[PDB]
Every structure is written in C-alpha cells, then in structure tokens.
Amino acid sequence: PLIKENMRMKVVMEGSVNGHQFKCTGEGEGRPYEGVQTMRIKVIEGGPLPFAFDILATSFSRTFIKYPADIPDFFKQSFPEGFTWERVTRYEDGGVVTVTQDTSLEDGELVYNVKVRGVNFPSNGPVMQKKTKGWEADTEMMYPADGGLRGYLDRALKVDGGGHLHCNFVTTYRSKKTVGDIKMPGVHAVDHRLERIEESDNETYVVQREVAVAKYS
Numbered sequence: 001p002l003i004k005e006n007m008r009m010k011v012v013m014e015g016s017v018n019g020h021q022f023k024c025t026g027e028g029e030g031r032p033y034e035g036v037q038t039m040r041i042k043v044i045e046g047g048p049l050p051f052a053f054d055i056l057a058t059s060f061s062r063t064f065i066k067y068p069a070d071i072p073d074f075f076k077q078s079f080p081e082g083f084t085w086e087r088v089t090r091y092e093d094g095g096v097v098t099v100t101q102d103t104s105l106e107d108g109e110l111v112y113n114v115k116v117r118g119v120n121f122p123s124n125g126p127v128m129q130k131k132t133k134g135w136e137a138d139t140e141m142m143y144p145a146d147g148g149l150r151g152y153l154d155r156a157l158k159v160d161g162g163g164h165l166h167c168n169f170v171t172t173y174r175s176k177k178t179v180g181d182i183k184m185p186g187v188h189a190v191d192h193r194l195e196r197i198e199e200s201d202n203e204t205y206v207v208q209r210e211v212a213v214a215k216y217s
Contacts, residue, residue: 009112097118187217190215194210
C-alpha cells in the first residue's frame, strides 16, 4: 500500500487573519492505521501571531484516522492522487474562517498545502487577546455527498478563567481519484482529540498531537 504503517508529512500554510499575514511550515509523522500523529510547526513569516495559534491547529491531516475494517476509508483509498478539502468555520463571537487544502503524496511522504483566511475576529475576544488554552475533544459527523464527504463539527475552545468559546465548521472532502474507484462509506462519525504538546517563543514554535478514530453513528 502507498499508505504505510509509518508515514511522514510536510505542510506549508499561507494565511491572513483580520488582515495579519503569515506563513507556517510543519513536518511530522504518524501511524495512519492507529489514528495517531504528531506535527512540529514553525511560524516562519508574520510571527509572533497577534492571535491564538489555537484557531490554526485543525488546519494542519485526514490520512491518519483509524477506520474499522467495516467502514470504508475515503482518504486512504484516494491515493496516489490524494484529496482536497474546503472548510468554513464560524465562532459564536463573530470570527469567520475559510480554509482550502490540497493533500498529495510526494516521494513516499504526505505533502499538505493550505490557505487560511479569517475575518471579523473581535479585537477584545479571547482569540485576538490570546486567552485560549486548547480544544476539547469533539466528534465530526461524516456524510456522503456527491462522490465526496461532508463533515460537521461543533467545537469548544477552552478560555482562560474556565469558560469555552464555541465554534462550528463544515468541511467538504473531495478525492482527486476518478469517481467510481473508491468504495464510499455511509454515514459515520470521527472522534478527535488534539493536544498541544509543547510551544516556544511566543507560540512561533508549536508541537501538536492528534488521535482520531472513526466509528458508527
């Protein structure tokens, strides 16, 4: 298989949030059939970011979901061509993010190119004030939609002081493999748990780890 029990990934991100432009690079590794991955991320342009890195965390990896044998794995079936995704996210206090992503396989390694654009984050809110403390575990509902998948997520960003800032996003995943070559799964869910492992220098260096497991709804 093109997706081995050990896989490395590289990512390049360009983005802007409230007009602040930035660039990130990441590299990491994981076990795609165990649903575990780790990534080391550097803000190489525009740092230190004037907003919480937490809002970028989920734009940095769908090949590393543990799928039971009975649930078709849309993402692992997509190679060698790979897949793309597009995401729209809204925070309850006004922020809106659009993200587009391309996933390819180059010299046996996964390569991600991502574009992030966020607007209307309140200057007094926890994101622009950098008063966030990582994400709670959450669950994505996955639905088949015209040869691809559509995912729905309600999320909770922990805030300093004990509260949560809520957001939700919808993602459409599309294969670059000609339709008709992939067994489509039915409705299912994906449990996610993303933790910040380490960070340095005003959040311009970040290490994160994610565990993701698909299951029946």
